[PDB]
Amino acid sequence: PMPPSEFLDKLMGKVSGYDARIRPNFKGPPVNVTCNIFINSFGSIAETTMDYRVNIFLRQQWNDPRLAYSEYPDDSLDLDPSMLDSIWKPDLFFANEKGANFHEVTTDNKLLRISKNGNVLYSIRITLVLACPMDLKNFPMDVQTCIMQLESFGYTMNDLIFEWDEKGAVQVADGLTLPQFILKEEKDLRYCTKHYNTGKFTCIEARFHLERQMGYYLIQMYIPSLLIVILSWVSFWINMDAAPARVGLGITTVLTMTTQSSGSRASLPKVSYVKAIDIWMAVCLLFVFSALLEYAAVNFIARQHVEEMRKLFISRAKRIDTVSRVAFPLVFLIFNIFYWITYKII
Amino acid sequence: PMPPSEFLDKLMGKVSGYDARIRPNFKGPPVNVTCNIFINSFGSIAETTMDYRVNIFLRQQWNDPRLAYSEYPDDSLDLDPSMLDSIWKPDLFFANEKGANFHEVTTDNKLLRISKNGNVLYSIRITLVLACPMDLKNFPMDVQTCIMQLESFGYTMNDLIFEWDEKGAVQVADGLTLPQFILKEEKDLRYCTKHYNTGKFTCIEARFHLERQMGYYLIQMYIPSLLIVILSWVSFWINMDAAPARVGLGITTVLTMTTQSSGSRASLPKVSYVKAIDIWMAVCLLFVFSALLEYAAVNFIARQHVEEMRKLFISRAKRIDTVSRVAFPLVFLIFNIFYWITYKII
Amino acid sequence: PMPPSEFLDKLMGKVSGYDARIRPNFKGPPVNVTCNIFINSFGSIAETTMDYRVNIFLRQQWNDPRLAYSEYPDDSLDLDPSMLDSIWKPDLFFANEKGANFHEVTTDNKLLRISKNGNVLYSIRITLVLACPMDLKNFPMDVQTCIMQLESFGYTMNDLIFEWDEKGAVQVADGLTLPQFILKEEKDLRYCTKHYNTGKFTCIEARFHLERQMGYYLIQMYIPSLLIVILSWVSFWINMDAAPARVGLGITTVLTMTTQSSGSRASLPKVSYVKAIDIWMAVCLLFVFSALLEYAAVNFIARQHVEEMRKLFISRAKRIDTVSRVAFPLVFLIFNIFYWITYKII
Amino acid sequence: PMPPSEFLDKLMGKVSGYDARIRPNFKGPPVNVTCNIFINSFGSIAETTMDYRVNIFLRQQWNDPRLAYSEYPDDSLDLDPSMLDSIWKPDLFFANEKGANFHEVTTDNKLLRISKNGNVLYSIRITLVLACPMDLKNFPMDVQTCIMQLESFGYTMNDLIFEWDEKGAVQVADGLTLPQFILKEEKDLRYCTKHYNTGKFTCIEARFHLERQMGYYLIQMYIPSLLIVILSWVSFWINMDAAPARVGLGITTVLTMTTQSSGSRASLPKVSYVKAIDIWMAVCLLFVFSALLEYAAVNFIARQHVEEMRKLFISRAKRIDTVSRVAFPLVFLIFNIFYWITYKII
Amino acid sequence: PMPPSEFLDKLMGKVSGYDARIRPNFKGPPVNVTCNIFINSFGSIAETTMDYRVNIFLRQQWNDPRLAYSEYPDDSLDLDPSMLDSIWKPDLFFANEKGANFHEVTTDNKLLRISKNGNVLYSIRITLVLACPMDLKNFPMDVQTCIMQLESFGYTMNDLIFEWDEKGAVQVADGLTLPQFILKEEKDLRYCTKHYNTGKFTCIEARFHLERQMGYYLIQMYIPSLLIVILSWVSFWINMDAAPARVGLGITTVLTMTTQSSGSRASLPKVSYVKAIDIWMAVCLLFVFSALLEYAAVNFIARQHVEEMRKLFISRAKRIDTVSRVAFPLVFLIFNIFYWITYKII
Ligand SMILES: *[C@@H]1O[C@H](CO)[C@@H](O[C@@H]2O[C@H](CO)[C@@H](O[C@@H]3O[C@H](CO)[C@@H](O)[C@H](O)[C@@H]3O)[C@H](O)[C@H]2NC(C)=O)[C@H](O)[C@H]1NC(C)=O
Ligand SMILES: *[C@@H]1O[C@H](CO)[C@@H](O[C@@H]2O[C@H](CO)[C@@H](O[C@@H]3O[C@H](CO)[C@@H](O)[C@H](O)[C@@H]3O)[C@H](O)[C@H]2NC(C)=O)[C@H](O)[C@H]1NC(C)=O
Ligand SMILES: *[C@@H]1O[C@H](CO)[C@@H](O[C@@H]2O[C@H](CO)[C@@H](O[C@@H]3O[C@H](CO)[C@@H](O)[C@H](O)[C@@H]3O)[C@H](O)[C@H]2NC(C)=O)[C@H](O)[C@H]1NC(C)=O
Ligand SMILES: *[C@@H]1O[C@H](CO)[C@@H](O[C@@H]2O[C@H](CO)[C@@H](O[C@@H]3O[C@H](CO)[C@@H](O)[C@H](O)[C@@H]3O)[C@H](O)[C@H]2NC(C)=O)[C@H](O)[C@H]1NC(C)=O
Ligand SMILES: *[C@@H]1O[C@H](CO)[C@@H](O[C@@H]2O[C@H](CO)[C@@H](O[C@@H]3O[C@H](CO)[C@@H](O)[C@H](O)[C@@H]3O)[C@H](O)[C@H]2NC(C)=O)[C@H](O)[C@H]1NC(C)=O
Incomplete structure (x- = not known):
């Protein structure tokens, strides 16, 4: 009521x-x-x-x-x-x-x-x-x-x-x-x-x-990092002689890895301890300097060499040949099996 | 009242x-x-x-x-x-x-x-x-x-x-x-x-x-992507010999496609699934590496070659000639007819 | 009171x-x-x-x-x-x-x-x-x-x-x-x-x-665009032969026009219709590719050429000479008289 | 109380x-x-x-x-x-x-x-x-x-x-x-x-x-502008011949002056009238193009030149030598005494 | 109650x-x-x-x-x-x-x-x-x-x-x-x-x-600065002759130090007095110009040199050799012991 x-x-x-x-x-x-x-x-x-x-x-x-x-x-x-x-x-x-x-x-x-x-x-x-x-x-x-x-x-x-x-x-x-x-x-x-x-x-x-x-930074950061590493190595599938093509195809790969690393830490808080995205890319940095290290390894031995002079030079040009075709992917494939497994168990 | x-x-x-x-x-x-x-x-x-x-x-x-x-x-x-x-x-x-x-x-x-x-x-x-x-x-x-x-x-x-x-x-x-x-x-x-x-x-x-x-990102992202692709191909309408012009006109096109891709995902939320703007441009990336792939294809055969040595080299320099004039636009024109039709029906 | x-x-x-x-x-x-x-x-x-x-x-x-x-x-x-x-x-x-x-x-x-x-x-x-x-x-x-x-x-x-x-x-x-x-x-x-x-x-x-x-974007965008166009053309007042200076002075001008165009649309709403600042600069883009087009025009004819071979080459090197000294400013001076008059009456 | x-x-x-x-x-x-x-x-x-x-x-x-x-x-x-x-x-x-x-x-x-x-x-x-x-x-x-x-x-x-x-x-x-x-x-x-x-x-x-x-933009903008100007001029203290080192040391200086000018007007309101920071740097721009102007001045006379041909060329290579060692600092030192005195009295 | x-x-x-x-x-x-x-x-x-x-x-x-x-x-x-x-x-x-x-x-x-x-x-x-x-x-x-x-x-x-x-x-x-x-x-x-x-x-x-x-800017700014300094010096462990590799490996290092310095002062208030991060990097700048100074030091003496002409040139090519292998790390190792000790006591 x-x-x-x-x-x-x-x-x-x-x-x-x-x-x-x-x-x-x-x-x-x-x-x-x-x-x-x-x-x-x-x-x-x-x-x-x-x-x-x-x-x-x-x-x-x-x-x-x-x-x-x-x-x-x-x-x-x-x-x-x-x-x-x-x-x-x-x-x-x-x-x-x-x-x-x-x-x-x-x-x-x-x-x-x-x-x-x-x-x-x-x-x-x-x-x-x-x-x-x-x-x-x-x-x-x-x-x-x-x-x-x-x-x-x-x-x-x-x-x-x-x-x-x-x-x-x-x-x-x-x-x-x-x-x-x-x-x-x-x-x-x-x-x-x-x-x-x-x-x-x-x-x-x-x-x-x-x-x-996981898939976003995979797309933004992992895959453009992934391209340069193979792009560094076809720059060893380059010609026999120490060419300016070996000069140009090396430095092009290096600056992009610097460029991706510049845009890598775009929106990140400034933590002291090391995170996972930079050790992904700092390893990709020290991989991409090895090709320019490899050219100077060719270039110093090219200046080291004229019969017996070039005889050692082309022999070392083959020890740099058949090893780097094997050593390049092996150090990178051993990296990912070292990398992801800790990040797969956590 | x-x-x-x-x-x-x-x-x-x-x-x-x-x-x-x-x-x-x-x-x-x-x-x-x-x-x-x-x-x-x-x-x-x-x-x-x-x-x-x-x-x-x-x-x-x-x-x-x-x-x-x-x-x-x-x-x-x-x-x-x-x-x-x-x-x-x-x-x-x-x-x-x-x-x-x-x-x-x-x-x-x-x-x-x-x-x-x-x-x-x-x-x-x-x-x-x-x-x-x-x-x-x-x-x-x-x-x-x-x-x-x-x-x-x-x-x-x-x-x-x-x-x-x-x-x-x-x-x-x-x-x-x-x-x-x-x-x-x-x-x-x-x-x-x-x-x-x-x-x-x-x-x-x-x-x-x-x-x-639709027309905005057409102007900002599609058209500057569109220019580099033809710019990659006139870099095959370049001279007969493996020149440093072939070196320079290749790497110039690649870094701009990286540069446009850097400014591509400027204001985007970080979705895991792949969107449409990157597959527009990642294909434009793998197109623009093919020209540098094409120079090393010239450069490795140039180092492969002296009568019979260069005889195979200039013959392969024509198999790289008459095919790439046909193969370059065909893979790109088949791309857009593969691309836009799904985006025209949705 | x-x-x-x-x-x-x-x-x-x-x-x-x-x-x-x-x-x-x-x-x-x-x-x-x-x-x-x-x-x-x-x-x-x-x-x-x-x-x-x-x-x-x-x-x-x-x-x-x-x-x-x-x-x-x-x-x-x-x-x-x-x-x-x-x-x-x-x-x-x-x-x-x-x-x-x-x-x-x-x-x-x-x-x-x-x-x-x-x-x-x-x-x-x-x-x-x-x-x-x-x-x-x-x-x-x-x-x-x-x-x-x-x-x-x-x-x-x-x-x-x-x-x-x-x-x-x-x-x-x-x-x-x-x-x-x-x-x-x-x-x-x-x-x-x-x-x-x-x-x-x-x-x-x-x-x-x-x-x-009007004077601001004149200073920021028009004048740095204005410099490259003449800078593209003194790169035709360059030496007689197809030099790497012709290579370097061409690509330097192109990337800056890309760089200014990157910073061009910095603070703009994303309208579909074309505005006036990009047609100012996209024309400046297609002008700056013409110099690299001009080098390959030199480079393809240089590879085309040995008495009668170079006789046509140096003759075409003069048809590219005396026309481009006339054709470069004329297409740009006809552009501004096409450009500004609509923007002077509105 | x-x-x-x-x-x-x-x-x-x-x-x-x-x-x-x-x-x-x-x-x-x-x-x-x-x-x-x-x-x-x-x-x-x-x-x-x-x-x-x-x-x-x-x-x-x-x-x-x-x-x-x-x-x-x-x-x-x-x-x-x-x-x-x-x-x-x-x-x-x-x-x-x-x-x-x-x-x-x-x-x-x-x-x-x-x-x-x-x-x-x-x-x-x-x-x-x-x-x-x-x-x-x-x-x-x-x-x-x-x-x-x-x-x-x-x-x-x-x-x-x-x-x-x-x-x-x-x-x-x-x-x-x-x-x-x-x-x-x-x-x-x-x-x-x-x-x-x-x-x-x-x-x-x-x-x-x-x-x-005053000291901040001195540090950020004046001093990096100051380095390139001398860096432009040691690029004239470069070797006798028209080298690709003259090519490379010129264009490197130019792009940084563009790069500093890009970051120059970072936080500025868009006033129509010209301010003081750009006339500091636009002069530094037109100084840095003079070195590339100087190389083409070498390069056109190098192509102009064979006894009497090179005799004028090396004579003009000295008129470009002893004047530019004097003319480079003099136009810049007369600039600052033209520059700062108005900005010292206001 | x-x-x-x-x-x-x-x-x-x-x-x-x-x-x-x-x-x-x-x-x-x-x-x-x-x-x-x-x-x-x-x-x-x-x-x-x-x-x-x-x-x-x-x-x-x-x-x-x-x-x-x-x-x-x-x-x-x-x-x-x-x-x-x-x-x-x-x-x-x-x-x-x-x-x-x-x-x-x-x-x-x-x-x-x-x-x-x-x-x-x-x-x-x-x-x-x-x-x-x-x-x-x-x-x-x-x-x-x-x-x-x-x-x-x-x-x-x-x-x-x-x-x-x-x-x-x-x-x-x-x-x-x-x-x-x-x-x-x-x-x-x-x-x-x-x-x-x-x-x-x-x-x-x-x-x-x-x-x-301390460790953050160590990672972001010190370590990429640290790499270029050694990268500047292996560019002196480069070949005997004044090569375009000496040209390319020099300018690559310089622009990155400019690039890191561009991103260095990203989030900083505009104080007049000099801070510690720039004197870290401006010294890294003036170190990285010394390699290009070193190439022109090679290049001017190469143009200075033909029996007695090159005899002084290769002798000065050794005075630039054995000193720079010693002088490069010594000026940098004396820098850090000059640098950090004030920043360790404050
Ligand atoms: C707001 O709208 C709803 C939806 O129409 C009204 O509910 C409906 O109200 C009517 C009459 O109050 C109901 O009709 C009666 O339904 C019974 C059983 O179905 C039937 O035997 C009667 O002869 C009469 O037709 C109807 O069922 C009812 N529907 C629902 C879903 O509740 C509601 O009254 C409205 N309220 C106001 C304040 O307008
Ligand atoms: C606010 O302003 C409006 C606009 O003037 C006023 O409305 C107008 O008011 C006048 C007198 O109140 C109207 O005039 C009369 O019109 C009739 C028929 O047209 C005519 O036979 C009379 O001899 C007399 O002239 C006028 O029509 C009317 N206009 C409209 C559009 O309504 C309104 O009164 C004002 N109000 C105040 C509070 O000031
Ligand atoms: C606030 O301050 C103003 C400014 O002093 C005061 O106004 C002034 O007030 C005085 C006395 O009230 C005025 O003086 C008288 O002026 C007349 C004519 O000039 C003269 O014949 C008298 O012998 C006497 O001196 C003065 O003129 C007046 N000035 C102005 C500009 O108004 C005002 O009284 C103050 N108010 C308060 C609440 O303090
Ligand atoms: C808050 O705290 C202050 C600080 O202690 C108090 O002020 C102090 O109050 C006491 C007693 O009220 C004062 O002591 C007296 O001082 C006189 C002269 O020095 C001396 O002859 C007396 O025998 C007695 O000791 C003291 O001087 C005074 N100090 C100051 C700096 O004022 C205050 O009373 C406190 N208030 C409350 C509400 O707690
Ligand atoms: C909110 O919940 C708490 C947690 O259960 C209640 O506290 C508990 O209240 C009961 C009865 O009021 C207590 O049980 C009694 O404990 C004594 C000694 O252990 C035992 O001898 C009695 O036979 C009886 O079982 C219990 O100890 C007590 N626990 C705690 C931790 O305080 C509380 O009453 C609740 N309040 C409301 C408003 O619901």
Whole structure:
């Protein structure tokens, strides 16, 4: 008969003595707020900034005995967010925020509904740009575990407790795709219970394994590196004599490997430790100098040589011939079987 | 006689028992909110970010029996947005927001007017920066269908229903032009009715086919690629002997194709799958190495050759002559008829 | 005697029945709001974004009979913007906003004063970043007409009318200078009266012819293009024989024209249609390949040639001599008289 | 005895008839607001945007007879900014704002204190990003005078007057250092009294001479330009004959001068008029083409030459020898004494 | 029995005469606010902008005798930030702000709790982007001391005093890692007590030594510089005669050192004084010109030389031989022992 907000106005109002400023079960057990998120959007992972943008549905669940209606014959009683500040709320935040906001588009995107026993369902939409450290040892082949963590600010452990729910504590959007990564489904859930001069505080937290898209930097960086190496070697399938063609076909290959290495570290954070993309290419550098080393190996022996003079020269021109046809691919094929296997097991 | 806002103040006020917190037809049928948009501005499609900026007029239409005036002799009774919060509103949002705002320029750009039976016309102006996935298989020749979707947050399906109206549910500005695309007029309208732990919620949604401007990357990337290919071949219309002109005219063409390929993938998202612009140019790469392959084919046979020695050499210098005048354009003209036809049918 | 705000408090207050929510002359003629702007700042025209930042003084003028004081012996009665929301205001906005704001620096920069008959002077300061389409056919020599337009949102035509005033409807700052353009003084003023499913709405609008600064891209792009063309031709004033100097002085000129063309389209929106800066330079490209075409024209005839063999060769070496000294400048001087005259009349 | 805010609450409250909406000395003399600023931070001068970020302490001083307490035995009575809106304030703004804000960090950074006679001390903290035109005729050697100006918005001249105070009207931070400039201590203070259709308004304004750091572009642009010029000339200290070393050492110098000129105008606004950095380098361009001009001067005379043929050739090879050893430095040393002296007197 | 906020409502309310506008111990001693921070996040040090982003927990501690409850049997009485504005707060700010904000994510991240004697614990979360000057004399090997400073705005020294606490006045996060630096644990704490026309104000301040990650620019800039120097010298281990290989292997090394120097100063602020990275590379420039100087030293003596003519030439070809094998590494090995030792002691 009576409208429920009118019933709610005398429920949580000054009548019935309800305060919005006091936690439920005060002078009693700590409040167990169980939670789960629905990731709407995810990504734009600025590895320069070492962070990621994510848009979630933060769902929060707890119970208030002060809000347990009895006579009203329904189960879930919703509330437009005008009266949302009139009730108690948790002091949730993120320990790795780096910028966030609500979404006031047409409405404060804020859900409330209350069970008969006062089980409080609370859902809001938050866009987060969460910082995460980026271990880039095997940089195109890393599985980044960028995390997120949810803590209480005023209420300590003894008055409030965050929880994950057991039934799928991270719901994921169906077409949630990543331009550069794959979100693995296994999402670790644990506690990061802090300690301060103030004291200790609750923390639930989530972990997100992100295996990359290997094929991109394969296309951009590996394959143009791959061409020059064979291009360095057909520059040994070049003519018998020390020609200016041997001069030109050598230096052309070297500058492109410098050029690809210039554009290699274009969007990278400036980590001290060596990553995987440069040792791919610095080896390709020291391979591409060997051809110019090989020409001077021809050129110094050509100047070393006139019967007996050139007799040693053309003999050494064959020891440089039949070995380099074998030694060039062998040092490169032994490189990849040395290279990829560590990056295949990690 | 009495001013209408004064009539409206006792209409929707505390007198006549009107609440802003309760949906119309409560404990009854779900509210059918029909809607249509007027796209003022559209574009700045950051394909790096895979999104698009759009400025709309979100028009919303429904009915409230609580707001049905009877005695007042007019039809549409407007309202400046001061009293807009005093009435019920829907909980509309976007499932792919990525940033939005209202427009408070001189006035909250918010329209209300009410029919005699309380049919509520509601219009606001929103700038959106809506995310959309970007399939870039045929990257200069794709028809991108970037979408947008409109959902309820608190009210489920059983209490609220979004609708498109039949009479032109997306109105488009007249001079709405795109710097890189064409908005096709056919705009698909359907439902994206979600399901959650909370439950199910209404969704109407719109789809926007965007065929590009083919001619730009034609000018920037195809035509400078086109010049080098013929420039590679007049470098076979070069002199009889293995000259340093054959050395210089070969390597000049190769580095520019590397240079255009460096500036090719300038503003591109890092997708794993191969797009169309690189297979345009990687083929142009492997074409441009064939000329340097052709010089060494001349150079190795020149070193292979003295009567019978040069007799085979000049004979092979003609088998490299009359075939390459035929084989060069034929492998390229067969490429484009292999290339464009798939990109002409999609 | 009594202070005027105290006189104003009983003027526009609840006493004397004044509403801020009702337009003047309600149930009567539409309100004629005449307006004019003072452009404080203007520019930073992001042609990539196809917009321009402008900071204006939006002056608005109309009349309210409800605000016509009688007994107070003065003419213009100002008001600090605290009481500005207490009166009626128009629902002005911009149809091409793309971001705007007010200016709360030390004070809401909001002017009100009221005549004896209630003629309302209303002035505020707005920074706008207004979108404008950019026709770039003659890109360094275009006169861009970037516009701005001012519409009503809730009030239709029959209740409200925007106007320009006759007496200089766009006031311009004195030292309002542009880094890349010239604002022509002639500013077209007309109507963009829209029509919707809602109905029709008033619009006044202004137009701004912007002729560029021609001399910049002259310096950056024309003059370095100009040097290579003569540098291509002194490479024909080179020695008699087909030298490696003819090889080196040719390819040096070609790569710089590629290099300038790489930096040519640095900050340009990706329009499909051809602009003027590339046809300046693509012609400079096909001129610079003619010198390498000319060397191979020497080189093929040098290999074509031994008495009668070289007799034709040196004769053709003179037909390539005396014609190219004439044919080189003539095709370029006929180009500019073909080029600039269309760009001098538009 | 009684707390002073309680004394202030009945001082400026509704009792004693104080209005915040009325200027002091109303229906009397115009209010003389004297002011001075303390520049906390200054710089990040985006010459592309032609503006500068500055963070100030805007101190404002005037007198209110309505706020002159009498009985309270102290001199300066401060006020936390909660009651700051309860009093009158000036309508100060900036005519060249381009974005600004207050600073609500832990507190509205807003100072009030009141003398016994009601002399009002008012100080706030503002970060400004102030636009300034950038005359770049002598671009590395200009003294930029970027200004700032402070005007009233509603109150005209006859009701309000801004002033500088005599005692150091611009206080400057001690370690206020600039990454690219030097703030000269002489700061011009004058009036920019505007005139409008509304009328005339007060303006005080400040001027800031900014002499650059000459040594940076000296290091980046002058010194690498300086090396090539001598590198062009040791390429004339090259061997007797027209060698391919003369070919290679010429073109190497030319492309670097193109390369430095490409990176020269990296961060520059696109002004039409010629600046100083390009005439530094375009002269360095036309110097570096003279060496390739000198080789062809050798090469054409080498092809011109066989007893009497080479006799003129080696004689002209000495007229090109002994003159160019003198003519090369002389045209460059006469250039700098032509160059720097205008840039030393301005 | 009675809830504590209800006890707090009559504690700090209008009853018991509590004002939020008056400092504690008014007309008495200055308030000693001791403080300490917990750095949550730190970094993204934009050396171009000369600043750093930091996210802190600003903890503030003082005492209010007005807030000393007596009868309530507990020690720390917390308060959700709704009633936070109802009490007195300090006027803290930062003198080097450059942008800051609070964090309203789900809750104003604002902590209050009050001891029995009214010792006020106050903690909030602030993200700061704090400016700091960047001395870049030894640019890859500098220890940057970027500071932060905390001042009062309205309250002077005689009414308010900031303090550090003795017990670890800067708490640091455990996994607080830097992408480019190391935060040294020693953090200097002192006073920056300002003086103005207003007067003098309290200041506590903190200092943060930041030693870089040396290994990055080692990898990016030192090692590619290191390769060319040996590559310059094997270009002297080249053949006996003045070959075009000596021409080509010289100029290839020079342009890469120009290319690395172009990408060297990519992200650097434009300081006038010379840094350490360029004197690393300008020496590498003047080393790499010596090889081309060495070829012309060969080439001029080759043209100087026919019995006695070449007899001096091959003798000078040995004085250029046996010295340069010794003189090349010696001038470079003496450089590094001159270089690094100053950068090892600072
Ligand atoms: C939130 O969840 C926590 C975790 O279960 C609850 O704390 C637990 O509360 C129960 C009953 O209140 C305690 O059980 C009792 O333990 C004593 C001693 O172990 C035993 O003698 C009794 O027979 C009884 O089983 C339990 O110890 C306690 N655990 C902890 C770690 O505190 C808490 O009550 C929940 N609060 C709310 C508001 O739901
Ligand atoms: C919003 O639109 C929906 C869709 O039409 C409306 O729901 C429909 O309401 C009508 C009448 O209220 C229902 O018709 C009735 O159906 C029963 C059983 O089918 C039949 O025996 C009756 O004779 C009568 O025709 C219809 O079933 C129902 N459809 C659905 C899917 O619920 C709704 O009433 C509209 N609400 C408002 C506020 O306009
Ligand atoms: C705002 O300006 C418009 C444009 O002038 C005003 O509308 C005009 O109002 C006048 C008098 O109210 C109308 O004149 C009358 O017209 C009738 C029929 O044409 C004629 O028989 C009468 O003798 C008289 O001249 C005029 O038609 C009308 N024009 C339009 C287009 O509506 C309007 O009144 C102004 N409103 C305010 C508040 O100033
Ligand atoms: C703010 O400063 C201005 C500038 O001094 C003040 O205006 C000046 O006010 C004085 C006295 O009120 C005027 O002096 C009188 O001038 C008349 C005619 O010149 C003379 O016959 C009298 O004997 C007396 O000296 C002075 O003219 C006037 N100047 C101007 C330019 O208006 C103003 O009063 C100050 N206002 C406040 C609130 O401090
Ligand atoms: C905040 O801390 C300051 C620093 O200690 C306190 O100021 C100090 O207050 C004490 C007692 O109020 C003063 O001691 C007295 O000094 C006089 C003269 O030196 C001496 O004759 C007395 O026997 C007594 O020892 C002390 O001088 C004073 N120091 C300064 C620099 O002012 C202040 O009281 C503290 N305020 C609060 C609210 O805690």
